[PDB]
Amino acid sequence: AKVPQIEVETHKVAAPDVVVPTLDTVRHEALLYTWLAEHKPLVLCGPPGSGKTMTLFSALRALPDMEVVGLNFSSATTPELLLKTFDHYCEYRRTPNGVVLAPVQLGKWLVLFCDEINLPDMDKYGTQRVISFIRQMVEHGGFYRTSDQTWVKLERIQFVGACNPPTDPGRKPLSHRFLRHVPVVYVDYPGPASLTQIYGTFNRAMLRLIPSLRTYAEPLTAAMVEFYTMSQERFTQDTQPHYIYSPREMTRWVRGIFEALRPLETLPVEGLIRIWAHEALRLFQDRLVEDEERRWTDENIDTVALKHFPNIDREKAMSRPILYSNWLSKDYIPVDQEELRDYVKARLKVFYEEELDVPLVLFNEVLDHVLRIDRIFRQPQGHLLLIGVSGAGKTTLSRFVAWMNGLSVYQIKVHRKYTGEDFDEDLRTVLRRSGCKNEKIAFIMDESNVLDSGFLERMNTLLANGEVPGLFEGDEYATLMTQCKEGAQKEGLMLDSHEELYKWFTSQVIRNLHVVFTMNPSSEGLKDRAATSPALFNRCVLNWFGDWSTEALYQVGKEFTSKMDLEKPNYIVPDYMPVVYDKLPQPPSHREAIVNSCVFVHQTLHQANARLAKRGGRTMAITPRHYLDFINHYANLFHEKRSELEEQQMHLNVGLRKIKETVDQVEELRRKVNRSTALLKSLSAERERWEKTSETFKNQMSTIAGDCLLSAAFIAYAGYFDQQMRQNLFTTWSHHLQQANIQFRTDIARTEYLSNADERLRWQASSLPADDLCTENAIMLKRFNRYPLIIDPSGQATEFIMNEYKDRKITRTSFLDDAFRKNLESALRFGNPLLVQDVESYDPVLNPVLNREVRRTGGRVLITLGDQDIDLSPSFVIFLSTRDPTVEFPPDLCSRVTFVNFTVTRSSLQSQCLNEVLKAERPDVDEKRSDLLKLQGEFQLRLRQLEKSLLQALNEVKGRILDDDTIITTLENLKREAAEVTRKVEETDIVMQEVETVSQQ
């Protein structure tokens, strides 16, 4: 009856200050007006997004002497929040014939809008402190201030709360002794017809921009409502806490469609359907966690679009990569995937020179995410919440898009001492930069950068209100007031009053401050984080990055191994191939099988982690940074092994050619001779194996792909596991590679292939146990991309590293030591190795240097530690270590460093026991054992030296045997190696057997 069918203006559609008069709205608004005019505190209980806040403001704007103050309740709030709110706005604490509290603005009441009032946690014995405070200051009409223990009576103050049903998880019922003074009104979700009419008016207002889609106003609305209803009856909150779909989603839907239609002049129905589907994907396809729900959403979006528009060109409207951007063009328009990829590649090349010289691969997912984040940064108050595994690129993508949008990215520098006061000062800094001296800011927070719940509540109020009350107190208030006055004069606004300048500052902060919260997808942490801060789930759009899909892993693998010579024309495709990549071509080439096996290995790590978790102890999380390290190791190892084999073959071939020339010489002299024939026979004794090696060169080159793959996978992934799990992982990888007919030289130990005996001698002499696991761990310490972390119960690896880098003046330092910074700085400016212990108390200032956040300055790489920026020396290497095998590290450090586990093996323990018992029981035999082992190592070193020097000299000579030096060198070399073989064979026959027999008992 009293619900006019108003027609909204073609602009300001779905604006914050507009509502289509419906039956429920006019009834509830009248009831709220009745209760508020009586100054009776009240409460609105309904599901989030029902329309409680808008109805309250509609009722309030009718009252002209009634001004509202917002308040957001978390689950960690105390009456101190209300006390600060009253101190900030109700300055008058006057006490004429009794203490009374009143606002400055005389003749005006005050409504303290407390939202989510039932979140505040109830302590033991079931009591809510702020609820009890409200019951006291309502029923008794006042409170007791703690300053003087005097009764303060409220004047021109009233309370309205907004809450949710008790059955809603995270919610707790209020006490009946409190519900007496506050009437409750239940606001439900607008019904199907109600939504149809409410948003139908919005759609008809919006489509008036294009006077050719007017006839499409009534179908479009219905379609949206249809789809919306499905999302309510399919993605319930019973599955994950963030699956709440409210009319707010339909509001931001209409707003997005309208904004995508504002600058554009003419557009067919196909474009409208495409924009509608893109918006529905940006509102219903992002918060989803798993791919099944995503496929369901895509199927039903296309289905409802086809149902509500029977005469449509499906392909033109519904293409698969539904992308939109305002980078390629000046107007928000669709963009093809390939042009966007090329453009973002070029822009990222520029970005590298700007910041973060760390390279990035651009696969399909990256493009989608950067488009979403750009959308959110373009909004006035755009708060984003990225949930994905650490290292997936959330922070770097956010910084990239923020740089694209001109935002000055500002992140807090969390440390061990970091406390509430430090974070308050950081908030003061960012707010002072944003409000006064206006400049856009991409304030990036991480789920680990929050230490105290005070940080969470401060971020909650900053996000929701747009301004934290009481942060600038005393002198800070006056200084901010002065700065805001200067900024207003610069902008042109003439403001003098305190509240006018404060409101201007709050508006500026809302407009020019975007918060990006990056969090890890931890189960049962989503609900807890929602309870402790509802703003993240109300005032922040949620983007579920998740973990890189097999498709994404395949793309990055191919992109980085686009330089490797993986082509094998004779690669026989097996009868059965284990398909891991969803879109793997069924007749794949060699490269498309190598990358498939790479993604299979990365998927194998997840199964191994699950198996360890089910029966065993702690498991370290697998991140995309591990895959990046695996691919970098694979590429580097391929280049190194290929170069070594090619150089070896070159030297062998040139030496054999010189030997053939020598044969020509001796034969043409025979057709001074005895020495020639003697050297011919002695050299042919080696020529036989030289020809064997030259023949097998092709075989070795054939199997260089699988071997490098297995070695890289071992030295990049199985750095944390024990011997049994390492062997099982390697066996599974080998079985899969054999299934894919990938060539790899079997019967060759990984430790021998990765490391030659030359450096193994130095390691063993450098106090390293002579066993497989310790050799592999040393290999991992040698070839590393992210700086290592040593997890050793015993301290052996510590002195191993100390001796290995002793020649470089390696310095010993610990996190706990106060001079840790200075020493660190010294290393950063001097390029001397640094070993850091006590990693449990990790200092996050190391986060940039671990990620190599260097900046090229025309030849000098520059790194920022904390807030001070220092040049970096290329000789700088840093190591991390601890003595606690069972200890938990902060999540931010989990993906930033390689892990090497120095466990003990049954074989190593047996060897140590045997060596000690032979040292004690039979000291003479132990002395023999030690002197023969060292002597054998010296013989092997000499064997490698003389053998290599022979080839080097043979290559160097460009003449013939007539040279006087060559003959004497070759004769002395052959004599020396024969004599060395004599000692080797005799010591391995007559003295090693006796030692073994003695040790056998």
Binding site: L328, S329, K330, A346, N405, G406, E439, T857, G858, G859
Partner: protein, 316 residues
């Protein structure tokens, strides 16, 4: 006004081109690239003439003096070299900037150089010796470009702080702080005196007591818009929109009738400001267009690019 038929496509650089300029007298054109090579071509015949090595890292900007005998270049190695163009030799080198120098220009008086760098300051050097004499400070971020006015009594510098500051050379005082762009300002350019009166006609700006309309200035940014400011009043006379990407270079037509500009949209755009008559578009390069220049007398235009190819267009 240049038209779609390019006259020559000169390609020799192994790295993206950054700046291209015309020698004020001789019929010779110069292009600086990111391979530290100042390659010198001939635009009349489309022929390579001779390269100029000497810098260690990418050259960001180059400029000639009033007589053209000297060529000052600034590189990413924090070095500003000076070149005896008659002899093709580096007669002097200047250091002092904390990070890379991304701009350079010679005073029209011919007795000083100005440079802008990522160290958030602008330095001024003397030609006779090479010693820094003045240091303009006040920018809060990377300063991208500095370009003095015609008589040399003022300079203008744009920076990543999304502001354009007009400085007084005589006393280092910040005469104006024009800040209305929504992104990083990439390029600026002064208004030649011949266009002064025409400016007053296009924007309707009113004249002051002295009769001088007040020096005008252009600012291109990554906000895809080209704003035009009046220095004497510090207000945005007009804005020009239409680019599909970040504006990289912007300049006035010698006749004071068109505004030429190049952006990363791979297009050279000729815009009209008096009557908004022409909005000509040229698919200049297959990749980003980094800089452009218009010959003062001869009817030619040159544009650099990231595709490592310089192009010469004829004006008809």
């Amino acid at each position: 006004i240049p038209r779609p038929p390019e006259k020559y496509a000169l390609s020799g650089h192994r790295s993206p081109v950054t700046r291209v300029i015309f020698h004020p007298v001789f019929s010779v054109m110069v292009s600086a690239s990111e391979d530290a090579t100042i390659k010198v071509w001939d635009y009349e015949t489309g022929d390579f003439e001779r390269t100029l090595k000497g810098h260690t890292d990418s050259v960001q900007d180059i400029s000639f003096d009033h007589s053209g005998k000297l060529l000052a270049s600034c590189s990413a190695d924090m070095t500003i070299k000076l070149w005896d163009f008659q002899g093709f030799e580096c007669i002097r080198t200047m250091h002092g900037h904390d990070h890379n120098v991304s701009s350079v220009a010679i005073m029209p008086n011919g007795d000083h150089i100005v440079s802008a760098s990522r160290d958030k300051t602008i330095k001024m050097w003397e030609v006779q010796t090479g010693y820094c004499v003045k240091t303009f400070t006040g920018h809060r971020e990377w300063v991208r470009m500095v370009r003095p006015n015609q008589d040399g009594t003022l300079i203008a510098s744009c920076s990543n702080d999304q502001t354009v500051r007009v400085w007084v050379v005589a006393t280092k005082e910040c005469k104006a702080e024009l800040r209305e762009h929504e992104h990083v300002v990439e390029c600026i350019s002064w208004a030649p005196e011949s266009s002064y009166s025409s400016i007053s006609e296009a924007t309707g700006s009113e004249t002051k007591k002295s009769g001088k309309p007040g020096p005008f200035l252009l600012s291109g940014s990554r906000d895809k818009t080209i704003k035009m400011w009046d220095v004497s009043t510090g207000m945005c006379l007009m804005t020009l929109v239409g680019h599909d990407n970040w504006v990289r270079g912007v300049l006035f037509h010698s006749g004071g009738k068109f505004i030429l500009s190049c952006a990363d949209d791979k297009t050279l755009r000729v815009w009209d400001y008096k009557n908004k008559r022409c909005m000509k578009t040229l698919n200049a390069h297959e990749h980003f267009v980094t800089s452009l220049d218009f010959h003062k007398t001869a009817p030619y235009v040159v544009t650099g690019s990231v595709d490592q190819t310089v192009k010469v267009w004829e004006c008809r």
